[PDB]
Ligand binder design. Structure first.
Ligand SMILES: C[C@H](C[C@@H](C[C@H](C[C@@H](C[C@@H](CCN1CCCC1=O)N1CCCC1=O)N1CCCC1=O)N1CCCC1=O)N1CCCC1=O)N1CCCC1=O
Ligand SMILES: COc1cc(CCNC(=O)c2nc(Cc3ccccc3C(F)(F)F)[nH]c(=O)c2O)ccc1O
Ligand SMILES: [Mn+2]
Ligand SMILES: [Mn+2]
Length: 180
């Protein structure tokens, strides 16, 4: 199907990020040409996770998001057997070696409060850190511990708002906001 959203996602995001989002959606049994809003969402989430890992020290983060499910769970099991942190019931996004905790990164189109509430209700181990961003420039982290420096998060919010602006300029932001 000829979707403007698909072409915009391919023009906006990095090709390797697009390939990773495509592989993730195909592994989860979703059509990137049909679920174009979910395609944009997966690309955005991947890019935000990569920018997050880009912040901090060189060996600070172990990246779980992006890998296929089997290898991702393998790295999670290795981290749990190495450090001793409780195994999470759901696949997280990163692991902070400095703070020694799993990080779940979320990107929302609504208020960060509701999104964080749903995520804290989903995750039951509580030991997993949750860091939520929004397309309006807001953020919320567990225990007010935002992990990274202010600049590394500020560039993330800037990129999110740029993506929102481009979506609105292409007249696709309304359906993308209604999709969530
Ligand atoms: C480690 C290796 C690759 C990393 C890739 C990851 C994403 C990176 C994309 C690259 C291109 N860069 C780097 C310069 C800008 C850019 O665009 N960045 C960073 C910015 C946004 C983005 O997209 N990063 C982060 C650190 C440097 C790097 O390259 N990946 C891929 C998924 C898992 C992972 O860790 N691995 C590991 C195994 C598979 C693989 O390929
Ligand atoms: C069983 O469902 C889950 C699967 C996973 C492992 C892989 N998916 C993510 O890692 C992840 N997916 C999403 C959005 C999404 C997209 C597809 C299905 C379900 C969901 C969610 F349910 F999350 F809305 N947003 C994240 O930020 C994000 O990290 C983790 C937690 C889950 O509850
Ligand atoms: Mn994830
Ligand atoms: Mn996430």
């Amino acid at each position: 199907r000829g979707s403007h959203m698909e072409d915009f996602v391919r023009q906006c995001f990095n090709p390797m990020i697009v390939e990773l989002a495509e592989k993730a959606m195909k592994e989860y049994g979703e059509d990137p040409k049909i679920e174009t809003n979910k395609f944009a969402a997966t690309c955005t989430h991947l890019e935000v996770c990569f920018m997050y890992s880009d912040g901090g020290s060189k060996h600070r983060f172990e990246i779980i998001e992006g890998r296929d499910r089997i290898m991702a769970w393998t790295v999670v099991n290795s981290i749990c057997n190495t450090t001793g942190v409780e195994k999470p019931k759901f696949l997280p996004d990163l692991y902070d070696y400095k703070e020694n905790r799993f990080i779940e990164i979320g990107v929302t189109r609504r208020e960060v409060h509701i999104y964080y509430l749903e995520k804290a209700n989903k995750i039951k181990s509580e030991k997993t850190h949750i860091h939520i961003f929004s397309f309006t420039g807001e953020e919320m982290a567990t225990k007010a511990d935002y992990t990274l420096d202010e600049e590394s998060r500020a560039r993330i919010k800037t990129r999110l708002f740029t993506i929102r602006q481009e979506m609105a300029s292409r007249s696709l932001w309304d359906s993308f906001r209604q999709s969530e």
